[PDB]
Amino acid sequence: HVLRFGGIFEYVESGPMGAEELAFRFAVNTINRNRTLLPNTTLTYDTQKINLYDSFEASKKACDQLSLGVAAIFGPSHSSSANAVQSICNALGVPHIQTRWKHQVSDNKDSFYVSLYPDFSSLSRAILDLVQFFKWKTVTVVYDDSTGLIRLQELIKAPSRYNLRLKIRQLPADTKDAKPLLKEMKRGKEFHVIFDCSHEMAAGILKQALAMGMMTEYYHYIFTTLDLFALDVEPYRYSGVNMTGFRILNTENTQVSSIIEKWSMERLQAPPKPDSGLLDGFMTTDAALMYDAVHVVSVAVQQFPQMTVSSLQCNRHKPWRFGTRFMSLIKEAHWEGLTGRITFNKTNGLRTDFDLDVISLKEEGLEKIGTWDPASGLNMTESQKGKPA
Amino acid sequence: INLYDSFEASKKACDQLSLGVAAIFGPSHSSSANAVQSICNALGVPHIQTRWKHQVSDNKDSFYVSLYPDFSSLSRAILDLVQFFKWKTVTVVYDDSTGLIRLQELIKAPSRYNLRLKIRQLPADTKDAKPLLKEMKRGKEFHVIF
Amino acid sequence: DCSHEMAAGILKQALAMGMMTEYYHYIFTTLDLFALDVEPYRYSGVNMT
Ligand SMILES: *[C@@H]1O[C@H](CO)[C@@H](O[C@@H]2O[C@H](CO)[C@@H](O[C@H]3O[C@H](CO[C@H]4O[C@H](CO)[C@@H](O)[C@H](O)[C@@H]4O)[C@@H](O)[C@H](O[C@H]4O[C@H](CO)[C@@H](O)[C@H](O)[C@@H]4O)[C@@H]3O)[C@H](O)[C@H]2NC(C)=O)[C@H](O)[C@H]1NC(C)=O
Ligand SMILES: *[C@@H]1O[C@H](CO)[C@@H](O)[C@H](O)[C@H]1NC(C)=O
Ligand SMILES: *[C@@H]1O[C@H](CO)[C@@H](O)[C@H](O)[C@H]1NC(C)=O
Ligand SMILES: *[C@@H]1O[C@H](CO)[C@@H](O)[C@H](O)[C@H]1NC(C)=O
């Protein structure tokens, strides 16, 4: 048996394609081999290359894929294109997967989509638990673009409950012009910084702060990104700095590291950039989310054997006859992947339960110092250091 | 047009441009206006937006105008009013998260002056303002902006 | 008190050790201070003389 998926990827001109497409093709190859699941059915796909930051081209490619006939469209990363693809697949009833966080409209009435990216409400309360553990009074939150203010909503609302002083600054459009901003932060004399940006932006900010001579024993940085292992701590390890972040890729598991070395040769197929200050040979988190997304789609479609793909039409409003049952089978599968266990909130379809672990910069590198959970709060080995009778 | 349906707005815009018009005065909701703006920017037809929507910082569309006042200038006017009134502690109360996009200069203004900020969000329904007003009275501050 | 090559080496090691603050003041007895790279330390607020 055969089954086709819908892949939409915002491509880059020249070089290799995006790492999400590499993870998608590698994951399809590892489902087409290694017969743990899907014995009677093989999986094919169809990838399209759409324009960066456009939604009409995304709608055209989604209608081309739906006229071709797919099982589930794997949506893009940009917010407006994901909104358009969410609208068309909601109107046609085809299930949708998001590997990237988008701004959720509160009064939107859609139910034909899931997003395996962790919710920033739970991430924001994880940051709140970490800043409550460190006993801070004045903190400065630095973001890059305005939508991050949506992503740190509970951090903004948290001075209404505690005695936490909080200042907020925005990084400029030019990535190398942080020197006035870091000069102002050095003049203001704050030593408690929460950065909210991508890992490449965080690497550029950290390098320009090293050129600023900022980080010491006094300063302390908390990064909201989940790609802290992509950075190199070689020019920052011996300076006594307490960079702290969150992780979701449980590299302690052996099969996870097997996936790491299975993706390492395709990573080094693309040339690295040593000037960027990024450690090559490591998974970005969205590739792991795409891997776990198509794996949980695979274990959901394994339970449904009568999956027939119909070439639906955008110009008509005839929904798929299997879309409701397939979505109501997707929305509860407890597949164990590279991001820990995967569960979906049944109210909205957003991933709100996960097992992060907090990492910190030690003198030997980045080490795991604890574990965050939504129900269990924040248990860590440092708090359980002194436990006498 | 239906409530919050970007594909329906896309289909109506396609049918209307197949009928042929000069310019389109699009919807009042942000996602459908974004889809209609992208479609008419791809097809060259001008767009006129009445209500403010969130602008993506790196969208290269140039076939659209907006007639709501820009919320950066509104935030600067609000900050001018607050700095005229000589205040220290304020409570920003919003309902939709895009208001945090709208009043971003007011949140950045503690880096400028010695302004104390308390920011609260109204609940999902409309009749449950009373617990927020009870928390407002119990928090013992008076300068409230909505 | 060293050569300018050892001065560049000890300056890179001091940058890696977080010595490049406003507190630290450095005096070099070598006469080749323009031979050193002025770029990665001139924004750190150090006092090199
Ligand atoms: C599916 O999505 C739902 C989204 O609506 C999830 O509901 C949300 O659940 C979280 C986690 O339980 C809630 O988080 C926290 O807030 C409560 C306090 O709210 C209390 O005050 C509110 C006042 O308006 C009420 O609305 C609440 O119902 C309740 O009256 C805290 O008690 C929680 O605390 C954890 O954190 C604090 C420190 O901050 C500790 O004191 C606690 O002991 C514990 O350590 C949370 O902070 C959230 O309120 C809730 N609702 C939303 C977002 O609207 C739902 O859980 C989710 N389900 C699954 C399965 O994923
Ligand atoms: C920073 O790290 C040191 C050693 O790792 C630790 O003793 C200290 O408590 C940390 N925090 C601060 C604020 O210095
Ligand atoms: C997590 O919490 C449990 C008890 O709640 C504790 O036994 C365990 O040691 C904690 N994990 C770590 C890494 O400290
Ligand atoms: C460093 O030089 C500045 C002048 O630029 C001076 O104000 C400051 O006191 C000096 N600091 C030390 C530690 O010598």
Side-chain angles (χ1 to χ4, degrees):
Chain A
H1 200 64
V2 69
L3 201 81
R4 197 182 315 122
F5 288 159
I8 293 180
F9 293 90
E10 267 185 333
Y11 86 111
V12 183
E13 189 261 348
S14 79
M17 65 289 291
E20 316 97 346
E21 194 159 355
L22 275 297
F24 192 37
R25 279 191 202 119
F26 163 71
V28 161
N29 291 10
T30 54
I31 296 299
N32 278 338
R33 299 174 303 268
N34 191 23
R35 315 257 70 82
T36 315
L37 294 174
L38 277 297
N40 305 324
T41 308
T42 74
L43 305 191
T44 178
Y45 59 94
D46 178 77
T47 59
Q48 320 274 353
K49 316 294 218 61
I50 76 156
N51 196 11
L52 189 65
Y53 315 129
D54 189 18
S55 79
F56 167 67
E57 194 157 342
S59 298
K60 277 288 295 310
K61 284 299 188 309
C63 283
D64 289 357
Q65 277 189 340
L66 280 183
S67 165
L68 186 61
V70 292
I73 297 90
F74 276 65
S77 316
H78 192 219
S79 74
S80 48
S81 53
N83 284 301
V85 176
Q86 203 189 340
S87 189
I88 174 64
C89 73
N90 168 53
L92 272 295
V94 191
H96 190 274
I97 319 295
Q98 277 140 10
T99 190
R100 196 50 68 86
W101 186 89
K102 75 198 290 283
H103 161 53
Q104 284 297 322
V105 187
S106 69
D107 53 358
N108 186 23
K109 305 310 285 163
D110 200 347
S111 164
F112 272 97
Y113 80 113
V114 288
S115 89
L116 282 75
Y117 202 84
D119 200 291
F120 287 96
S121 309
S122 311
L123 281 169
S124 299
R125 79 190 72 251
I127 295 286
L128 189 51
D129 281 346
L130 190 47
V131 74
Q132 190 178 1
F133 170 69
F134 278 161
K135 312 290 186 37
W136 291 358
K137 321 284 199 210
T138 293
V139 65
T140 308
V141 168
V142 172
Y143 65 95
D144 43 356
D145 65 316
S146 301
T147 65
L149 285 184
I150 315 291
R151 298 185 286 120
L152 311 167
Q153 184 177 2
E154 265 72 27
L155 283 174
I156 296 162
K157 290 201 283 157
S160 75
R161 273 158 309 192
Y162 315 123
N163 54 335
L164 187 153
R165 198 60 65 221
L166 185 134
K167 309 158 63 51
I168 279 178
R169 278 174 229 266
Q170 168 179 9
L171 276 176
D174 291 331
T175 68
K176 265 76 61 181
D177 292 8
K179 298 178 190 297
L181 189 147
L182 295 179
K183 180 65 66 66
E184 284 215 21
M185 290 177 69
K186 203 175 181 182
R187 285 307 180 196
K189 297 191 177 300
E190 53 261 19
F191 306 101
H192 288 331
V193 178
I194 298 177
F195 279 129
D196 177 40
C197 55
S198 78
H199 49 275
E200 308 96 359
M201 191 74 78
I205 285 309
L206 270 179
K207 200 167 63 198
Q208 284 164 225
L210 187 52
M212 190 52 68
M214 193 80 101
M215 62 287 285
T216 48
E217 293 175 349
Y218 307 132
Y219 284 82
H220 199 126
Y221 303 97
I222 301 176
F223 290 92
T224 70
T225 176
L226 321 168
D227 268 340
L228 212 68
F229 282 172
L231 318 172
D232 47 343
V233 296
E234 200 55 53
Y236 316 100
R237 202 163 64 243
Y238 301 99
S239 43
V241 185
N242 286 319
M243 315 197 316
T244 310
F246 281 85
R247 213 199 47 202
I248 191 167
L249 279 79
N250 48 3
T251 67
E252 317 296 320
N253 207 344
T254 78
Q255 42 261 26
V256 169
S257 50
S258 86
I259 298 303
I260 296 299
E261 53 91 16
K262 272 265 203 179
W263 203 78
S264 176
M265 57 281 292
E266 283 85 10
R267 174 63 187 274
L268 63 93
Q269 271 157 46
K273 300 134 207 181
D275 44 353
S276 84
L278 290 168
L279 267 179
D280 44 351
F282 277 135
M283 283 279 284
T284 77
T285 183
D286 47 351
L289 267 299
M290 186 75 78
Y291 189 92
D292 282 9
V294 74
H295 271 232
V296 70
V297 165
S298 74
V299 68
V301 70
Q302 186 259 339
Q303 281 176 27
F304 208 52
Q306 316 99 344
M307 283 282 290
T308 70
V309 177
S310 162
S311 165
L312 294 149
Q313 188 38 252
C314 284
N315 215 347
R316 300 282 78 78
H317 282 278
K318 275 88 181 173
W320 196 24
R321 77 191 185 273
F322 293 151
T324 315
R325 162 78 155 130
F326 194 33
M327 170 52 65
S328 67
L329 201 57
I330 281 171
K331 265 198 190 173
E332 71 271 38
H334 299 337
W335 168 253
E336 172 58 49
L338 310 177
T339 62
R341 47 189 191 85
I342 292 170
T343 43
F344 292 91
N345 202 343
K346 322 290 284 299
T347 77
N348 48 354
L350 280 75
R351 176 150 165 220
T352 48
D353 177 38
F354 38 82
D355 316 313
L356 301 172
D357 48 345
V358 57
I359 45 176
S360 281
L361 176 59
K362 293 298 184 36
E363 213 178 1
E364 290 89 3
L366 278 168
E367 322 298 318
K368 160 173 168 152
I369 59 147
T371 288
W372 191 88
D373 265 344
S376 305
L378 186 55
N379 56 333
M380 48 200 306
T381 177
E382 210 275 330
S383 66
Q384 306 168 172
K385 271 311 281 175
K387 291 188 302 178
Chain B
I1 199 55
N2 211 303
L3 209 63
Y4 321 131
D5 266 332
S6 296
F7 169 62
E8 214 65 42
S10 298
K11 185 190 169 185
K12 283 306 145 52
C14 276
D15 291 325
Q16 180 165 339
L17 286 180
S18 171
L19 193 143
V21 287
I24 44 176
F25 310 100
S28 63
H29 177 246
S30 74
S31 81
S32 50
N34 262 338
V36 159
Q37 176 207 8
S38 160
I39 284 183
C40 73
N41 185 84
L43 271 75
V45 193
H47 201 193
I48 296 91
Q49 305 166 1
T50 296
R51 204 181 313 276
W52 178 90
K53 82 204 181 45
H54 173 86
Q55 295 297 319
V56 177
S57 62
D58 51 358
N59 194 7
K60 312 301 289 317
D61 294 329
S62 86
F63 282 149
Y64 80 114
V65 292
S66 72
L67 284 170
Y68 209 82
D70 177 40
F71 270 101
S72 71
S73 310
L74 266 187
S75 277
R76 276 192 299 275
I78 284 283
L79 196 51
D80 270 1
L81 195 84
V82 165
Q83 207 169 349
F84 169 68
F85 279 158
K86 312 290 185 293
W87 284 359
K88 309 301 292 291
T89 80
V90 288
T91 298
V92 179
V93 169
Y94 69 102
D95 45 353
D96 188 23
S97 304
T98 75
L100 293 185
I101 312 288
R102 285 152 53 152
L103 312 176
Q104 51 169 12
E105 277 80 17
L106 276 297
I107 310 169
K108 287 157 64 173
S111 165
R112 304 286 320 275
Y113 324 114
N114 45 359
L115 214 56
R116 286 298 159 261
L117 267 290
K118 282 198 182 63
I119 293 189
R120 293 173 215 275
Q121 183 198 7
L122 299 172
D125 71 280
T126 72
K127 267 78 65 180
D128 284 4
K130 202 150 161 286
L132 190 138
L133 273 296
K134 280 285 288 307
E135 189 66 38
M136 182 89 253
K137 202 160 61 52
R138 206 181 51 84
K140 213 170 66 68
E141 83 259 26
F142 311 99
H143 292 329
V144 190
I145 180 168
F146 291 119
Chain C
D1 182 77
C2 51
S3 71
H4 59 279
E5 301 95 331
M6 300 300 298
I10 201 76
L11 268 187
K12 277 179 185 172
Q13 292 267 33
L15 178 60
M17 267 290 168
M19 297 292 174
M20 294 289 113
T21 80
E22 216 182 2
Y23 309 128
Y24 286 88
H25 198 127
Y26 289 102
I27 290 183
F28 289 87
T29 74
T30 176
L31 299 176
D32 290 312
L33 197 63
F34 287 168
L36 293 186
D37 198 10
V38 76
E39 196 39 69
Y41 321 112
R42 67 187 187 89
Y43 288 114
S44 44
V46 306
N47 285 344
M48 295 176 42
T49 311

